[PDB]
């Protein structure tokens, strides 16, 4: 992985040694070049994962997440450089450094072969993320949002640290390849019930699981746009990726420990979808949309079927691009009217016709219009949960209906109707804003032509 | 209700005729029944007792509710009509033209030359319009939404821009 | 019930402004200032929208789709009594005689 780790680090010298007026051009261009080379990770085999060294390996699960992560860095740079224009030069370079360091921790997190190396990097992403939210957020509440984000995560992570170290003691290793062959079954006992909880609660909080999700709408509403992009696109998927790996050693206890969390997700997804119908804040609506989508991922990981794992892998990638696009779309409105109130600026399709096309495409992927990968992921999950229990189609069906209602409600309220009279600073969409939107939707729609590369190890 | 008694009766008369028209459809039949309905209004036209007159209004409204057409006729461009707000998607505020690219403005040299005179006329008049509203408004703010006319020559009626320059009802 | 004298005067003044604004919306003769047989048209349409695509599709189907098993599957032709098989020359026997009731 050094062909990706090292050039990612070299982005830091590049940013700091760039001319004062070229920090965005240089960092954006060279982070796109790194994104290009990440496609070499798709040298995947039918039987064996791609194991580079004792430290790093890349299978079909981590490969698409790595490519999503490295694609997101250039997009985040494009999305931030407007609202950071008045920033002090050094504080602009420190902002970019926080994003580069986040990418560094992320690509190492997704390829760590040892679970305790995964834990440290998994935890290391907190610091740059927290600093972005609290230093470069705009509102007073960004400070409270930082604390909720920090302490929700740590409340779960610290038990996970104890469980992993206990697992290394008893099994002798935490290398994920070794665990595949040395895994022993988990037999019922209160001791194992809490080993199971410690291994899964840290990841449940990151997804987040319904009930434990309150940190997420706070963080999104306060984060800067680049922070919201990485939060929704990648950092949520650290929970999913971690769960997909650790469940290997939790069998067969996962048979009955899953029930309380499937119930929370199946019911929680209807509850958070319905919350979206009455949200007044556009960013908060998108945040609650992520909770509903990630509920499906939690259910799919817990029912442990080949179809559900394929569906979860596609959902994580599809959600990553769609939710990131939606936050970017809402941000472009915010940079004009400087409010997140959804009902404030209406009828924008009249004033920004092409940006209204992006709003349409983003909404269609969010409601999972076939054959988007949003629909492929969501459909595969629904097929597998139906076999788990037929009655789940009722809850899946209702969520699909409510998901369409709030997706098109967001489209209709902001883009259609009459424009707000007194709002007269809706300038024409910039090239930067249109290119940012297209760099989200075009790769998302292109992946429909070749969806096998985002279906994960069980394809 | 801020409507006087006279306004309520006249409003009820119009509304009753329109719902009568929906029932009758045919113009000759409507004319026959509109005259009988008018005769009923003329019957109590001179009722000088307000208490009885108000009582007559209550029963009349009660009768209208029972007899109203469940699906009355609506003018297409009237609220609830089939063409209400049909053209709002084509009405674009005039401030959108300040953002046009110069190459777009060069295509209409004469239109944008005139537009500048209006914008010039708007800046020059604004201060006097705010002043006129300051001098004519009693302490404690206005009590009605009525606005004054201009009192001198060269003055424009205060708050005129968004009435004068509003989009055409059939813009595109 | 009519307009008050104050109201009528304001409606008068707005009206002259509005009618002048509407008059100014008209385009001048030189505006916009732009910058610098059926058989044939249906013949060119058929060429570019039928012949060229059907060339591509036939090439696609003949030398790529049909070279793989079970890509194009036809319902087998109906065989009726008395039919002759082109491939072999086999003649299908006629049905047995009817009661010929009419």
């Amino acid at each position: 992985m050094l062909k990706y780790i090292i050039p990612t680090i070299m982005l830091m010298p590049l940013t700091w040694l760039s001319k004062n007026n070229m920090i965005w051009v240089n960092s954006t261009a060279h982070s796109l070049l790194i994104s290009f080379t990440s496609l070499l990770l798709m040298n995947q085999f039918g039987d064996n994962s791609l194991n580079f060294s004792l430290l790093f390996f890349s299978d079909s699960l981590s490969t698409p997440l790595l490519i999503l992560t490295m694609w997101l860095l250039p997009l985040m740079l494009m999305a931030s450089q407007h609202h950071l224009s008045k920033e002090n030069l050094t504080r602009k370079k420190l902002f970019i450094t926080m994003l580069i360091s986040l990418q560094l921790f992320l690509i190492m997190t997704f390829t760590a072969m040892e679970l305790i190396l995964f834990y440290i990097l998994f935890e290391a992403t907190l610091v740059p993320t927290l600093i972005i939210i609290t230093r470069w957020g705009n509102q007073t509440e960004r400070l409270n949002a930082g604390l909720y984000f920090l302490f929700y995560t740590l409340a779960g992570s610290l038990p996970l640290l104890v469980a992993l170290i206990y697992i290394q003691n008893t099994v002798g290793s935490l290398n994920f390849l070794m665990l595949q062959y040395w895994v022993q079954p988990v037999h019922n006992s209160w001791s194992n019930v809490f080993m199971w909880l410690a291994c899964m609660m840290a990841f449940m909080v990151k997804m987040p699981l319904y009930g434990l999700h309150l940190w997420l709408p706070k963080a999104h509403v306060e984060a800067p746009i680049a922070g919201s992009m990485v939060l929704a696109a990648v950092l949520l998927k650290l929970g999913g990726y971690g769960m997909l790996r650790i469940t290997l050693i939790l069998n067969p206890m996962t048979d009955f420990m899953a029930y309380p969390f499937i119930m929370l997700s199946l019911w929680g997804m209807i509850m958070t979808s319905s919350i979206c119908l009455r949200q007044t804040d556009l960013k908060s609506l998108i945040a609650y949309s992520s909770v509903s989508h990630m509920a499906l991922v939690i259910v799919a990981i817990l029912i442990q079927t080949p179809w559900s794992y394929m569906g979860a892998t596609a959902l994580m990638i599809a959600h990553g691009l769609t939710s990131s696009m939606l936050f970017c779309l809402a941000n472009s409105n915010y940079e004009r009217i400087h409010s997140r109130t959804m009902i404030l600026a209406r009828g924008l399709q009249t004033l920004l016709p092409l940006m209204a096309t992006w709003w349409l495409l983003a909404s269609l992927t969010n409601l999972a219009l076939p054959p988007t990968i949003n629909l492929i992921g969501e459909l595969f999950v629904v097929m597998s949960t139906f076999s788990w229990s037929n009655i789940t189609i009722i809850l899946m069906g209702v969520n699909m209906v409510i998901t369409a209602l709030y997706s098109l409600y967001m489209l209709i309220m902001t883009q259609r109707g009459k424009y707000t009279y007194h709002i007269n600073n809706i300038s024409p969409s910039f090239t930067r804003e249109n290119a940012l939107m297209s760099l989200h939707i075009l790769p998302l729609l292109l992946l429909t032509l070749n969806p096998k590369i985002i279906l994960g190890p069980l394809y | 209700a801020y409507l006087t008694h006279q306004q309520k009766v006249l409003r009820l008369y119009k509304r009753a005729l329109r719902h009568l028209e929906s029932w009758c459809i045919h113009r000759d039949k409507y004319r026959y029944f509109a005259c009988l309905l008018r005769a009923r209004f003329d019957e109590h036209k001179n009722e000088k007792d307000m208490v009885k007159a108000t009582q007559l209004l209550r029963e009349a409204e009660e009768e209208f509710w029972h007899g109203q057409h469940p699906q009355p006729y609506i003018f297409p461009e009237s609220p609830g009509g089939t063409s209400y707000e049909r053209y709002e998607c084509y009405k674009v505020p005039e401030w959108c033209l300040d953002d046009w690219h110069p190459s777009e403005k060069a295509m209409y040299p004469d239109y944008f030359a005139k537009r500048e005179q209006w914008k010039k006329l708007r800046r020059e008049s604004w201060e006097r319009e705010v002043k006129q509203l300051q001098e004519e408004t009693p302490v404690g703010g206005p009590r009605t939404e009525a606005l004054p006319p201009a009192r001198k020559q060269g003055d424009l009626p205060p708050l005129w821009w968004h009435i004068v320059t509003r989009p055409r009802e059939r813009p595109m | 019930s009519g307009y008050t004298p104050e109201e009528k005067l304001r409606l008068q003044q707005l009206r002259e402004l509005r009618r002048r604004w509407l008059k100014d919306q008209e385009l001048s003769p030189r505006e916009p200032v732009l910058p610098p047989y059926k058989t044939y048209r249906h013949s060119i349409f058929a060429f570019t929208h039928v012949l060229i695509p059907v060339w591509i599709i036939h090439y696609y189907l003949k030398y790529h789709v049909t070279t793989k098993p079970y890509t194009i599957v036809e319902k087998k032709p109906r065989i009726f009594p008395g039919d002759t098989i082109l491939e072999t020359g086999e003649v299908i026997p006629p049905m047995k005689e009817f009661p010929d009731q009419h």
Binding site: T350, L351, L352, P353, P428, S429, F430, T431 | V92, P93, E94, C96, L97, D99, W100, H101, S103, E104, Y108, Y111, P167, R168, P171, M172 | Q25, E26, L27
Partner: peptide, 12 residues
């Protein structure tokens, strides 16, 4: 009579 049609900028 051809009236001017007000539109948002299509240039960008």
């Amino acid at each position: 009579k051809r009236l001017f049609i007000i539109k948002p900028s299509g240039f960008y």
